[PDB]
Amino acid sequence: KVPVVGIVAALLPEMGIGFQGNLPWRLAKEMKYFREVTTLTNDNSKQNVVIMGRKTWESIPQKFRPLPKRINVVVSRSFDGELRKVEDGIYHSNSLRNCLTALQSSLANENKIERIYIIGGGEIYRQSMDLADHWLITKIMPLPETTIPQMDTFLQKQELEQRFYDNSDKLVDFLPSSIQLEGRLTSQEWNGELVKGLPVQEKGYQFYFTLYTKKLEHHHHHHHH
Numbered sequence: 001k002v003p004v005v006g007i008v009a010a011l012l013p014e015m016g017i018g019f020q021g022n023l024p025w026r027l028a029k030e031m032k033y034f035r036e037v038t039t040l041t042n043d044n045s046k047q048n049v050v051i052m053g054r055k056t057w058e059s060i061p062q063k064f065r066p067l068p069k070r071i072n073v074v075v076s077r078s079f080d081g082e083l084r085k086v087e088d089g090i091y092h093s094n095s096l097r098n099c100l101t102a103l104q105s106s107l108a109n110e111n112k113i114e115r116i117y118i119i120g121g122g123e124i125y126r127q128s129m130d131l132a133d134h135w136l137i138t139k140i141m142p143l144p145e146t147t148i149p150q151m152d153t154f155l156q157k158q159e160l161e162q163r164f165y166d167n168s169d170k171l172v173d174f175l176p177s178s179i180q181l182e183g184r185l186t187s188q189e190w191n192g193e194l195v196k197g198l199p200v201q202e203k204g205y206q207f208y209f210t211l212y213t214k215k216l217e218h219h220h221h222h223h224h225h
């Protein structure tokens with residue numbers, strides 16, 4: 001009932017997302033997008049959830065966690081069950097799947113969550129291809145003089161483009177209404193792939209905010225009683 005949206009920054013063409021437990025770039029504008037999208041709501045009485053794997057949690061600077069103004073959920077197989085408050089702003093879960101089911105309960109949530117963002121990292125995203133309704137992907141490209149950074153963790157692009165299509169024509173409409181983006185929508189070829197979305201440049205990179213949406217599905221079965 002509430003949308004589940006994976007949100008990720010990935011370097012084309014392999015969709016690398018990390019190296020040695022850290023982000024491979026430090027891009028203040030990309031970080032401001034991530035901050036605004038995950039914080040902002042259309043309805044002022046609601047908040048978003050951000051769900052993350054334990055290793056991703058551990059990498060957020062201690063000063064800056066839990067991420068303000070959002071319900072933070074950290075998942076670890078060493079935690080107690082499926083959604084437990086552990087501190088102000090912090091829930092622990094031992095299951096990505098059961099966590100999402102628990103968050104969807106209208107009785108538990110009082111319909112006061114807008115969206116559930118899955119914010120990383122590699123192992124969490126792998127498991128989220130069949131759970132997310134959408135992906136907000138920032139597609140990052142080194143500008144011609146820029147050294148490609150080393151990376152060790154990747155988005156599963158095959159399974160992405162299996163299940164989802166590039167819906168970036170609708171990105172503006174999908175973002176919380178109050179966000180303001182600097183680009184206009186823009187389709188560019190880059191190493192043999194079509195890159196469509198909202199352009200920024202910062203430091204040695206160009207990046208596009210893009211939206212992926214689930215492909216239409218055939219009606220094979222609906223469960224009857």
Ligand SMILES: NC(=O)C1=CN([C@@H]2O[C@H](COP(=O)(O)OP(=O)(O)OC[C@H]3O[C@@H](n4cnc5c(N)ncnc54)[C@H](OP(=O)(O)O)[C@@H]3O)[C@@H](O)[C@H]2O)C=CC1
Nearest residue numbers: 008009018022023053056076077095096120121122123124
């Ligand atoms: N570019 C981007 O947009 C982002 C990139 N990243 C990058 O990703 C990398 C980190 O990814 P990765 O190492 O895969 O780690 P994760 O952040 O995905 O955390 C993995 C941990 O999550 C727990 N976990 C995984 N699946 C489940 C499950 N189904 N139920 C309960 N717990 C689960 C386990 O914790 P435990 O071991 O305690 O049981 C596991 O070790 C880093 O390099 C980081 O920089 C991260 C976020 C965003």
Ligand SMILES: COc1cc(-c2cc(C)cc(C)c2)cc([C@@H](C)C#Cc2c(C)nc(N)nc2N)c1
Nearest residue numbers: 007008009021022023031034059060064119138
């Ligand atoms: C591995 O280390 C991490 C560090 C941070 C982090 C670093 C600083 C300096 C400040 C703050 C508040 C957080 C965030 C993350 C995670 C949670 C992220 C992210 C993410 C981004 C930046 N962009 C898109 N598009 N999607 C995403 N899911 C991981």
